[PDB]
UniProtKB/Swiss-Prot annotation, chain A:
Component of the ribosome, a large ribonucleoprotein complex responsible for the synthesis of proteins in the cell. The small ribosomal subunit (SSU) binds messenger RNAs (mRNAs) and translates the encoded message by selecting cognate aminoacyl-transfer RNA (tRNA) molecules. The large subunit (LSU) contains the ribosomal catalytic site termed the peptidyl transferase center (PTC), which catalyzes the formation of peptide bonds, thereby polymerizing the amino acids delivered by tRNAs into a polypeptide chain. HAMAP family: Ribosomal_uL18_A (MF_01337_A). One of its GO terms (biological process) is cytoplasmic translation. This is Large ribosomal subunit protein uL18. There is a cross-link at K163 (Glycyl lysine isopeptide (Lys-Gly) (interchain with G-Cter in ubiquitin)). Keywords: Cytoplasm, Isopeptide bond, Nucleus, Phosphoprotein, Ribonucleoprotein, Ribosomal protein, RNA-binding, rRNA-binding, Ubl conjugation. Belongs to the universal ribosomal protein uL18 family. It comes from Saccharomyces cerevisiae (strain ATCC 204508 / S288c). One of its GO terms (cellular component) is nucleus. CDD domains: Ribosomal_L18_L5e (cd00432).
Curated annotation (Swiss-Prot), chain C:
Pfam families: Ribosomal_L21e. The gene is RPL21A. GO terms for cellular component: cytosol; cytosolic large ribosomal subunit. Keywords: Cytoplasm, Isopeptide bond, Ribonucleoprotein, Ribosomal protein, Ubl conjugation. One of its GO terms (molecular function) is structural constituent of ribosome. InterPro entries: Ribosomal_eL21, Ribosomal_eL21_CS, Ribosomal_eL21_sf, Translation_prot_SH3-like_sf. This is Large ribosomal subunit protein eL21A. Component of the ribosome, a large ribonucleoprotein complex responsible for the synthesis of proteins in the cell. The small ribosomal subunit (SSU) binds messenger RNAs (mRNAs) and translates the encoded message by selecting cognate aminoacyl-transfer RNA (tRNA) molecules. The large subunit (LSU) contains the ribosomal catalytic site termed the peptidyl transferase center (PTC), which catalyzes the formation of peptide bonds, thereby polymerizing the amino acids delivered by tRNAs into a polypeptide chain.
Swiss-Prot record, chain D:
Translation factor that promotes translation elongation and termination, particularly upon ribosome stalling at specific amino acid sequence contexts. Binds between the exit (E) and peptidyl (P) site of the ribosome and promotes rescue of stalled ribosome: specifically required for efficient translation of polyproline-containing peptides as well as other motifs that stall the ribosome. Acts as a ribosome quality control (RQC) cofactor by joining the RQC complex to facilitate peptidyl transfer during CAT tailing step. Belongs to the eIF-5A family. It is found in: Cytoplasm. Changing G13V: Temperature-sensitive growth phenotype. Changing S35F: Temperature-sensitive growth phenotype. Lethal. The chain holds residues 106 to 157 of 157 of the full protein. There are two genes for eIF-5A in yeast. Induction: Expressed in aerobic conditions. This is Eukaryotic translation initiation factor 5A-1. It comes from Saccharomyces cerevisiae (strain ATCC 204508 / S288c). Homodimer. Binds to 80S ribosomes. Actively translating ribosomes show mutually exclusive binding of eIF5a (HYP2 or ANB1) and EFT1/eEF2. Interacts with DYS1 and LIA1.
From Swiss-Prot, chain E:
InterPro entries: Ribosomal_eL29. GO terms for biological process: cytoplasmic translation. The keyword Ribosomal protein applies. It comes from Saccharomyces cerevisiae (strain ATCC 204508 / S288c). PANTHER family: 60S RIBOSOMAL PROTEIN L29 (PTHR12884:SF0). GO terms for cellular component: cytoplasm; cytosol; cytosolic large ribosomal subunit. Residues 1-36 are annotated as: Disordered. Component of the large ribosomal subunit (LSU). Mature yeast ribosomes consist of a small (40S) and a large (60S) subunit. The 40S small subunit contains 1 molecule of ribosomal RNA (18S rRNA) and 33 different proteins (encoded by 57 genes). The large 60S subunit contains 3 rRNA molecules (25S, 5.8S and 5S rRNA) and 46 different proteins (encoded by 81 genes). It comes from the Eukaryota. There is a cross-link at K51 (Glycyl lysine isopeptide (Lys-Gly) (interchain with G-Cter in ubiquitin)). This is Large ribosomal subunit protein eL29.
Length: 296, 169, 159, 52, 58
RNA sequence: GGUUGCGGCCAUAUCUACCAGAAAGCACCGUUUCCCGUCCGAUCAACUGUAGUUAAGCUGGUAAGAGCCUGACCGAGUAGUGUAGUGGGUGACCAUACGCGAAACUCAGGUGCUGCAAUCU
RNA sequence: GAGAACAGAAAUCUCCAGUAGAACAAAAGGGUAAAAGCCCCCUUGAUUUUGAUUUUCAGUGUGAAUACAAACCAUGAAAGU
RNA sequence: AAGCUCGUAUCAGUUUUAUGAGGUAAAGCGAAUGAUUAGAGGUUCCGGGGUCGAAAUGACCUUGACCUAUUCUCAAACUUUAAAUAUGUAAGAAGUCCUUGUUACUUAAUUGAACGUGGACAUUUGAAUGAAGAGCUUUUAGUGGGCCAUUUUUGGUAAGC
RNA sequence: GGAGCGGUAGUUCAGUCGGUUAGAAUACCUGCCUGUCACGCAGGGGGUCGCGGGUUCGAGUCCCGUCCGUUCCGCCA
């Protein structure tokens, strides 16, 4: 709208631009530095970070360790791959996040070999307990929670993702207070509420609450569930047998794709336009002087 | 060429500048409270003046940010004191507007003589859905020129519902 | 009176340099320092903790000790008659690697290869860097490119 | 801030006598004193004109 | 008594008479002000690795 | 090749004013019982991918645009400067030999590249 | 910059622009933008034992500072600090 | 001055090749910071003094700040840019690689880590030139009022200041 | 040729160096008294705290410069 305030020649010339990953607004550098910087006496020994991000209708979770060329992934795990584990609808919720975390844990440590040892907890009773130390035998694999920008509050699915991670074998150090059902008024964890949360108990209770409150909103939501024959008291058991679907075979089988990269290139390049040349530009300028200036 | 590019009220800020601290301000705070349904906030004087009478950081005025269907209610009944007649100014060049009124009594409120009389400032602020862009934490952005709230467009939107009179020079 | 603080006469030394303000970029921190490696010391005003003294700006020396977020560097300061060997404790942000040393190491790497090649040839190398030898006897070519004769140019006002 | 400390002996001062005289007439008596080396006695009388 | 206050004159010419003798370093440098932890570890390492060569190689 | 998450370098990437975007992707967008947090479900929280878009965002293109960059026998061997002279000059300073060597200006050329993992007619 | 009763050069509010033209206890210079700035939350690391180091230097002191250890704490979800 | 330990060491008031740091001379200000000469065009409802009008978010002149594009000029305590001269460090045996031992440190991991036995690679052993030896300790004298010259330069009108 | 000091209603001065306030005396003004003026009685106003800039929630007092006036030194030859 405005060109009276005027981003002038002078102002532009002496403008410093941030970093691209900050100019998008996607990477907190102040945090990132503090996170990734290794204790220099360890040398090349890398620091691994459990990246967890939540888009609208996906969860991304990836262990990354850095290198000055660019930050290299150890392994990745997504929520939209949960279909072949047996969870389809309602897939970016707290329980789903937990599941994703679990998958990433069991995956990375599977591919690193140890898995057999350091199975962690496999009760999932919602108790605050970390990956222990096996006396006589290798240390457990360590990795730190990278949130990025997603704000920290008690109850967030960020923390579900951590819970899933830690329980599934990977050492992520953490305090309890930001898991759901932490009593703020006195240092008293309730594991049973947390327990309920882990298997989508909040969601199931919500479904129960739309029995006689309203049943058009109920139809608006949960449409897929109605289609697939899913209901309240089945829900807690859906995540339960699906956890063992991870703990037998978590091995990452990628999609069949169909077509190859060249085909995709062929598709894409049709729509996006190329640049130009100098000659073409000069011609256009000539046209513009004919039409506007010379006036036919 | 108008599917998502719709228009609506984002929020409405009801405000009362009270020339001193303490009693009057507290009474105003009660006033806004029961009108809106939300409990208000109390702003501080940014610097010393003396000619007004106020000084540095004195807790001077009060306001409340109202949103949703609930703001529309108050806009209606309040807009009826000016009687569906605004001005050619009042609408800013950013596609927002406002109208000041006096006597809070003539918009639902009962007098109740311990309270008193206080004039109000309505400043309504507009948007097109998509203005999550600026206010969000992650992946902040600037809103493009074609999707901005202009003055003229806002005036049109106002005319179209409410049967509202723009009027004046 | 006279003044000699820890940052005496350092207006333009620790200036942050034009349009490169702030946000300590992250290559810096992942550059891995081994004991007994040569390092240059460009101080960095955008970090205050673990700073060098003004004297050591631009000065170069060997790393001796490592720690959590810093490195012990030794330098030969000149004082009175002699060289005295110091022991600094610079934070990693003020340091970069010696490019020259890296270059040297690469040269050494090539040297071994050259020696190996020579061996499969049957000895005789000549591996040292000789300077610019006084360039050889050659023949030029006129053919088309004739001596384009010049002259001196006369004095002219144009002012 | 606090109303404690009647002390301060009342003034020896002849100027403190006009204060002694003008008290019954009243009107916000604002009277400075000085603590210099722990010695404190009334120095000047002053009164605001309003404050209501 | 306005005497000459300071100069650095004819100082370099003193300096170069004996002449900027360099530190004269040794292999096995002095581990003084090297990380305590590291020093401790190295100690034990040396104690061990001596034993290996001493007991075995005979 | 596009697109996402994570990046390295940090504007050849930023800004101004416009126009294009199929697939998926994000993206906006629906809702507040629970965890959660606000003067306010705007923000952040959670719940739905269901109710709707490509209008914005993001990407790409355009402009004898700003800016930025890159080079040029472009200015210009210009200033300026290390070395020497019982060199010139009343001096200020200047020329000479051995060397070293800029900035503005002018012209032309460019307007992100690229690594890790995933996914897309 | 554009707007909102009393409201005016200025009192409160709201949007737009805004590379820093502010604010950082105090001189001046640096440094700082999801910040070292402002608002909130919880706190004593302004703690204990003794070295090593840099500065001014005679390479003594004093002061000031830096990197560490060994404790015991702080806060944070954590990386850390 | 006394020597001592060795006997071509590792060094050199130096260049070369390489790579660092610097913020001065220059330059720059139609680039920030300030300092400043001139008009042009805009601007005001958001400054006054007039003429046209009972008044007007008035018809029009005079200035006054502002804004835009241009202009002449500048800076020890201004700067995008940026020399020359001086300056740091490397030019390998205390090296490089191959195998593998050490540990109370560190690693998810006999991964790293520093230190190693063993094996290779030497007469261009890894730029120039020079080395009336190289290194090393003792002790003690006098000294601690300076001055002139080239160029750089501060006060000062200037001075054999 | 330097050092220190002063700065306010129309006048003499406090206030002021302590920063979120300008007081006394006289003069001036009004009414009253009085044949009329003085004296008195009862009320009232009047000072951008010399000027300009800066620091400051706030400057009249805090810092710097002109500006106009008062002081101190001018010794040994």
């Amino acid at each position: 709208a405005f060109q009276k305030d005027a981003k002038s020649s002078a102002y532009s010339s002496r403008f410093q631009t941030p970093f691209r990953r900050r100019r998008e607004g996607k990477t907190d550098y102040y945090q990132r530095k503090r996170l990734v910087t290794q204790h220099k006496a360890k040398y090349n020994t890398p620091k691994y970070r459990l990246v967890v991000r939540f888009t609208n209708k996906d969860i991304i979770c990836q262990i990354i360790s850095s290198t000055i060329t660019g930050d290299v992934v150890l392994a990745a795990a997504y929520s939209h791959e949960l279909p072949r584990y047996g969870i389809t609808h309602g897939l970016t919720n707290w329980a789903a996040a937990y599941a994703t975390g679990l998958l990433i844990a069991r995956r990375t440590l599977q591919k690193l070999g140890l898995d057999e040892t350091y199975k962690g907890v496999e009760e999932v009773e919602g108790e605050y307990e970390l990956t222990e130390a096996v006396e006589d035998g290798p240390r457990p694999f360590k990795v730190f929670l990278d949130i990025g920008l997603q704000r920290t509050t008690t109850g967030a699915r960020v923390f579900g993702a951590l819970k899933g991670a830690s329980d599934g074998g990977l050492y992520v150090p953490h305090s309890e207070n930001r898991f759901p059902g932490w009593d703020f008024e006195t240092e008293e964890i309730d594991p049973e509420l947390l327990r309920s949360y882990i298997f989508g108990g909040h969601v199931s209770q919500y479904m129960e609450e739309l029995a006689d409150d309203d049943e058009e909103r109920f139809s608006e939501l949960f449409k897929g569930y109605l289609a697939d024959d899913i209901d309240a008291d089945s829900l807690e058991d859906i995540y339960t047998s699906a956890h063992e679907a991870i703990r037998a075979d978590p091995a990452f089988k990628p999609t069949e794709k169909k077509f190859t990269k060249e085909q995709y290139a062929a598709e894409s390049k049709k729509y996006r336009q190329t640049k130009l040349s100098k000659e073409e530009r000069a011609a256009r300028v000539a046209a513009k002087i004919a039409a506007l200036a010379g006036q036919q | 060429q108008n599917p998502m590019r719709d228009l609506k009220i984002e929020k409405l800020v009801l405000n009362i500048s009270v020339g001193e601290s303490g009693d009057r301000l507290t009474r105003a705070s009660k006033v806004l409270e029961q009108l809106s349904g939300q409990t208000p906030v109390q702003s501080k004087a940014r610097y010393t003046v003396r000619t007004f009478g106020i000084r540095r950081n004195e807790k001077i005025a009060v306001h409340v940010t109202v949103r949703g269907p609930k703001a529309e209610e108050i806009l209606e009944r309040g807009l009826k004191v000016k009687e569906y007649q605004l001005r050619d100014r009042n609408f800013s060049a950013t596609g927002n507007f406002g109208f000041g009124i006096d006597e809070h009594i003539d918009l639902g409120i009962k007098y109740d003589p311990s309270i008193g009389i206080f004039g109000m400032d309505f400043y309504v602020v507009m948007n097109r859905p998509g203005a999550r862009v600026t206010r969000r934490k992650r992946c902040k952005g600037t809103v493009g020129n074609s999707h901005k709230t202009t003055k003229e467009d806002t005036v049109s939107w106002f005319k179209q519902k409410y049967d509202a009179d723009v009027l004046d020079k | 009176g006279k003044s000699h603080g820890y940052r005496s006469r350092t207006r333009y030394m620790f200036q942050r340099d034009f349009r490169k303000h702030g946000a300590v970029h992250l290559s810096t921190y992942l550059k891995v320092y081994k004991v007994g490696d040569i390092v240059d010391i460009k101080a960095n005003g955008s970090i205050q903790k673990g700073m060098p003294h003004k004297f050591y700006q631009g000065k170069t020396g060997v790393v001796y000790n490592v720690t959590k977020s810093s490195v012990g560097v030794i330098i030969n300061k000149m004082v009175g008659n002699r060289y005295l060997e110091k022991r600094l404790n610079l934070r990693v942000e003020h340091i970069k690697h010696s490019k020259c040393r890296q270059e040297f190491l690469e040269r050494v790497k090539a040297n071994a290869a050259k020696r190996a090649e020579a061996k499969a040839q049957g000895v005789a190398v000549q591996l040292k860097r000789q300077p610019a030898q006084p360039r050889e006897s050659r023949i030029v070519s006129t053919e088309g490119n004739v001596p384009q004769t010049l002259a001196p140019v006369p004095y002219e006002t144009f002012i | 801030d606090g109303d404690t400390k009647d002390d301060v002996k009342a003034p020896e001062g002849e100027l403190g006598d006009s204060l002694q005289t003008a008290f019954d007439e009243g009107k916000d008596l604002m009277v400075t004193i000085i603590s210099a080396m722990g010695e404190e006695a009334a120095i000047s009388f002053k009164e605001a004109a309003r404050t209501d | 008594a306005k005497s000459k206050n300071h100069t650095a004159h004819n100082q370099t010419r003193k300096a170069h008479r004996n002449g900027i003798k360099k530190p004269k370093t040794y292999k096995y440098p002095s581990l003084k002000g090297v990380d305590p932890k590291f020093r401790r570890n190295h100690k034990h390492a040396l104690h061990g690795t001596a034993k290996a060569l001493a007991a075995a190689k005979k």
